[PDB]
Paper text:
In Psychrobacter arcticus ATPPRT (PaATPPRT), structural and functional data indicate allosteric activation of catalysis triggered by HisZ (PaHisZ) binding specifically perturbs the chemical step of the reaction taking place at the HisGS (PaHisGS) active site located ~23 Å from the nearest PaHisGS:PaHisZ interface. First, crystal structures of the Michaelis complexes of the activated, hetero-octameric holoenzyme (henceforth referred to as PaATPPRT) and of the nonactivated, dimeric enzyme (henceforth referred to as PaHisGS) showed Arg56 of one of the catalytic subunits reaching across the dimer interface to form a salt-bridge with the pyrophosphate moiety of PRPP in the active site of the other subunit in the PaATPPRT structure but not in the PaHisGS structure. Therefore, allosteric activation was proposed to lead to more efficient leaving group departure at the transition state by stabilisation of the negative charge build-up on the pyrophosphate upon nucleophilic attack of ATP N1 on PRPP C129.
Intriguingly, upon PaHisZ binding to R56A-PaHisGS, part of the activity was recovered. In an attempt to gain insight into the effect of the R56A mutation at the atomic level, we solved the crystal structures of both R56A-PaHisGS and R56A-PaATPPRT bound to PRPP:ATP. The active site interactions are very similar between the two structures, except the electron density for Mg2+ in R56A-PaATPPRT was not well defined, so the metal was not modelled in, and the hydrogen bond between E163 and the PRPP 3ʹ-OH is absent in R56A-PaHisGS. The kcat decreased by less than 2-fold for C115S-PaATPPRT as compared with WT-PaATPPRT (it is possible PaHisZ binding allosterically disrupts a putative catalytically detrimental interaction involving S115), and by less than 4-fold and 6-fold for R32A- and R56A-PaATPPRT. In the Arg56Ala-HisGS mutant, HisZ modulates Arg32 dynamics so that it can partially compensate for the absence of Arg56. In contrast, when R32A-PaATPPRT and R56A-PaATPPRT reactions were carried out with Mn2+ instead of Mg2+, the rate of product formation increased, and the apparent first-order rate constants increased by ~5-fold and ~3-fold, respectively, in comparison with those with Mg2+.
Author numbering:
A (entry chain D): 21 to 29, 32 to 228
B (entry chain B): 1 to 290, 301 to 387
C (entry chain A): 1 to 169, 175 to 196, 199 to 226, 230 to 290, 300 to 387
D (entry chain C): 21 to 128, 130 to 227
The structure:
């Protein structure tokens, strides 16, 4: 396969338009599909549907030439080995600390439970606070309720999920949006295929 | 199992590395570079004098039990050459080469080595770009002598151009961090927007959008920029060096004036040598401070192993049973012959037993009618 | 400026080390030893597997940040050869050589180096003393090839003799006394088979009659005393080498499985060469190693030819004239002349011997 | 809660432990698979159930946010299990950990393994004396070999259907896998009076 491989994961739903106006409308509708690799209107582009967590991995190793990854994922994973070409300004949420509603700070070293371990260590370091961090893979809202951690680091848009689970947003860590990332080799060797899709996206977000 | 970024180099690979390390060393020496062999360990006071944060984090710390003082296992030989030049170099031109093991705490690139075999050359005490052209000449003699099918492409940059655009336009640390991140990520749109806000912004967007075309670049720069002789000379150096590489070495040269890595170490022209489509540069060179003018390059010799081939070895077994049937004088004669074959670089085994079999045998040395001769297996 | 036992090797010494390290490596390779280049660092699990207390204490520990696990900077390559032979060696005879930097926490002996350049050869999978005779022959061809004025004296020992006197009849006590040649203290401390233990110390040197001096009971020992005699004579007959014997040389008690060789240059305290039998199925093995840096003092190369192209003359050359002088200079470097294309009129190489000068359309070498 | 907190995973484990729990005297009030609640009561008011992602059960137990859990040996081996007691093998969710590559494609160079099971991978290929580059994945791994991110994957397989359906074939057997009953080390000492009956009933049931 001599063309571009695109790594996508909400994001599929919000990139469809960007892709439509770039000339890359998917054949099938993944949400109801068993296929891993997906063709598209452009026969020089294929799409990999991954878990958001994995998109930066596939791109960075060149199993995908470019991907749409949340800045949450990039910050946690480390974007050292990919180019961040453009901020798509989609999936606009934020990374925040969250604890139990009205619950006070304990008289002991803070214990953070989260999938965003590196983000947690980094944030609380810049606040000059010493934290014990616990890695989680699944839903994190339970962790404070059973006292696995005092706080969680998660992505929050409105606040509904936190509140519905008895949790309240504490500290704002940073803003988050889907970013277009590119493999370093792919950018040099397949730029002729990339430039039109990049120029269309730059156009689309304006 | 070994730690990530740590590998055995065994058998023919080890022989090949031995041959590379040695051929490249004598080449550098025949070009008038003085071989220096600094130690693997020093006190951090000397080893990391003027080090970056990247180099400090990359250097393993150990305690000197004799004195209680902190030492490091070198992650880079280049600073040791500085210490050596400061002591023995004098005020005039001086040339040094070196090949040595260095150790990194973390890998450079994805599944990258932490034990690179670092080989390099440096020229101290010459302002002229002539010294940068000399390093290019030595580097390319070395590379051509390896008879590789792999092609080296050279990216030229010049940190001076951007450092000057930053000074003349009085950029805040904040702003400079912004542009460098945007450059490093090829973010043209993000950069275009940000430049409409910044002073001389048009110049910063020009380096990104028109830097590749060096021959016209000065003409595209603002009156202010074109007035500054540091920028004029910098863009000149790139031209002189670019042409020399194409004309003299038939080298594909690209120009990227937004190549600002080693911002703190680099004081001017920077050359990066890429093998094929491999992400991490094989060769990292350019101008750096010592008021002692200095320029140099280094490569991980171990990254050449993949792109170099030696002729198949001749691996030879003396026939055990035949050799033992020989009288004393017959043995002196066969030993004189074996000595001759080793002179020629044949790998010959005097067998301890009838079963003693060398790895990858090619030939036995066998007796037939008063004559010892090689016979393929 | 540098820590004790840590030195630069600079300029002609560095070139000379480069030449030694290389000549000795290809010698070993031409004798059928396989070059292996193990790394400076491993996890301690592998690097110190079966290590002595001396080896552990001599090895710098460092932290792998990727895994949190302990690594070491090797103080000795020999154990890495074992690991390599276990993986690739098979069960037949196998030969390895190596050269590599090793690092020690504390100096070996008085004013010893902590950064020896370790060069060595090992033979795995042969019981016969024949393999020890092969190592001796290889080592001595290597040493003779250096055309040194310095003489190597070889001390032979055999740990088996004492290991047997120990089995057939404290150990740390005698070894301390032996290790210090403390005869009176040893004589007293001799009072099971005590007479034998004091005899090894007092009569070890005279190997030819030593069996006769040992207790009838004590008379492995027979063959051990035989190995020493075979090896001693071989070194005198074949290499005209002064050989002394010390059966109380139990330095490497933990590693050494039989015959041990130490090679001393002149009257220097620390052995230049440390060799003998060690274990590596019950896979037999024997080997030696030396610090290549310790040869630098006793080796001389031919003076280098260091050449300056005339700056003024070179600049007067048209393009085609420059192509031709470059072709000539390329030829001189092929021959091993050290040639400098000068950046300026003042550019002077260290230890200049010859200028390349233009006279009547011809470039020629002239002593300074 | 003065009583025992039980950490289960939804789907297969929950489905196959329900009977063991019924016969232990712990039948769930609500039916989780269709529910939004994190903590679940049960017929015994001294037992509550946490529904977690299988990946997290050993974490919640080890830190004492759950007193005991049902975890796959796959998860325990990967996570460590140094800080919990493995009281009994329930002999449910019987699958195996295996290497898998492309069908009839041979092993190439240094292997690149892509998997969730990184520590298992490093451990297995170490005992085979094989030198591997390991790539962490979070989502389904079947795509990784097809786009050449890895030469092999390490995954759980029962029958083989999923691998084959994705063009992959099971290669090497690493070890057998089943749900194991794990206990927090403090909980086992402090709440044994509550645990003994439930443990004895399970031992009986299997
Ligand atoms: N509430 C939200 N509003 C906007 N963007 C969001 C929100 N939650 C997540 N995102 C963005 O989408 C990404 C995750 O996508 P999504 O939530 O659809 O899948 P997921 O929950 O990560 O699924 P999986 O369990 O497969 O990893 C995040 O990295 C973030 O950039
Ligand atoms: N095919 C199988 N047959 C039997 N047991 C299995 C099988 N696959 C996985 N298991 C076991 O059950 C666990 C998988 O739990 P589960 O089915 O909930 O998967 P998960 O990865 O946690 O998430 P998901 O709900 O997406 O499947 C593993 O830890 C393993 O021990
Ligand atoms: O309503 P808000 O508080 O603004 O945030 C909505 C939540 O949904 C997101 O996951 P997603 O929608 O992918 O849920 P899923 O992982 O269960 O699919 C994310 O985890 C947010 O926390
Ligand atoms: O032996 P096989 O029949 O090929 O099954 C093996 C599959 O089972 C597991 O998936 P699970 O049943 O948990 O489904 P899900 O992870 O897709 O929900 C696992 O992720 C494997 O892909």
């Amino acid at each position: 396969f001599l063309g571009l491989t695109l790594a996508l994961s909400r994001i599929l739903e919000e990139t469809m338009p960007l892709l439509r106006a770039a000339g890359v409308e998917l054949l099938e509708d993944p949400e109801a599909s068993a296929k891993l690799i997906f063709p598209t209107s452009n026969p020089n582009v294929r799409v990999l549907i991954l878990r958001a967590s994995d998109v930066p991995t596939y791109v960075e190793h060149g199993a995908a030439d470019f991907g749409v990854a949340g800045k949450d994922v990039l910050l946690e994973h480390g974007a050292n080995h990919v180019y961040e070409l453009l901020d798509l300004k989609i999936a606009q949420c934020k990374l925040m600390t969250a604890g139990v509603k009205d619950a006070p700070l304990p008289n002991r070293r803070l214990r953070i439970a989260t999938k965003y371990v590196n983000v947690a260590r980094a944030y609380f370091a810049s606040q000059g606070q010493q934290v014990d961090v616990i890695k989680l893979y699944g839903s994190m809202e339970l962790a404070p309720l059973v006292g696995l951690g005092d706080l969680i680091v998660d992505v929050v848009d409105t606040g509904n999920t936190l509140r519905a689970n008895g949790l309240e947003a504490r500290d704002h860590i940073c803003d988050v949006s889907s970013r277009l990332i590119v493999n370093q080799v792919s950018y040099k060797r397949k730029f002729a295929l990339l430039e039109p899709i990049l120029d269309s996206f730059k156009n689309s977000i304006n | 199992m070994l730690p990530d970024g740590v590998a055995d180099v065994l058998f023919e690979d080890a022989h090949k590395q031995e041959v590379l390390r040695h051929q490249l060393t004598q080449q550098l020496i025949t070009h008038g570079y003085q071989l220096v062999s600094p130690p693997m360990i020093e006190f951090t006071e000397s080893l990391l004098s003027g080090a970056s944060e990247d180099l400090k984090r990359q250097t393993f710390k150990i305690i000197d039990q004799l004195t209680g003082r902190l030492m490091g296992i070198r992650a880079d030989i280049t600073p040791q050459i500085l210490r050596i030049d400061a002591h023995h170099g004098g005020d005039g031109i001086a040339r040094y080469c070196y090949a040595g093991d260095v150790i990194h705490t973390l890998p450079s690139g994805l599944f990258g080595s932490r034990t690179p075999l670092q080989l390099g050359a440096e020229i101290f005490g010459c302002e002229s770009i002539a010294a940068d052209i000399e390093l290019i000449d030595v580097l390319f003699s070395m590379i051509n002598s390896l008879d590789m099918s792999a092609v080296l492409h050279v990216d030229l940059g010049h940190v001076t151009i951007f450092k000057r655009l930053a000074e003349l336009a009085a950029l805040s640390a904040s702003d400079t961090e912004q542009l460098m991140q945007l450059y490093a990520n090829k973010n043209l749109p993000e950069l275009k927007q940000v430049c409409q806000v910044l002073p001389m912004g048009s110049d910063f967007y020009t380096l990104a959008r028109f830097g590749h075309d060096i021959a016209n670049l000065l003409g595209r720069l603002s009156e202010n920029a074109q007035q500054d002789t540091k920028i004029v000379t910098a863009i000149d150096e790139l031209q002189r060096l670019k042409a020399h590489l194409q004309v003299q070495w038939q080298c594909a040269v690209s120009i990227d004036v937004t190549e600002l890595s080693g911002y703190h170490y680099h004081t001017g022209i920077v050359f990066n040598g890429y093998i094929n489509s491999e992400t991490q540069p094989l060769v990292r060179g350019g101008r750096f401070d010592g008021p002692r003018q200095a320029t140099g390059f280094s490569m991980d010799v171990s990254r050449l192993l993949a792109h170099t081939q030696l002729d198949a070895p001749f691996i030879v077994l003396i026939d055990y049973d035949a050799f033992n049937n020989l009288d004393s004088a017959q043995r002196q004669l066969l030993l004189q012959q074996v000595a001759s074959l080793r002179q020629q670089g044949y790998r010959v085994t005097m067998p301890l037993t009838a079963e003693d079999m060398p790895v990858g045998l090619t030939h036995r040395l066998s007796l037939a009618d008063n004559q010892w001769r090689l016979h393929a297996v």
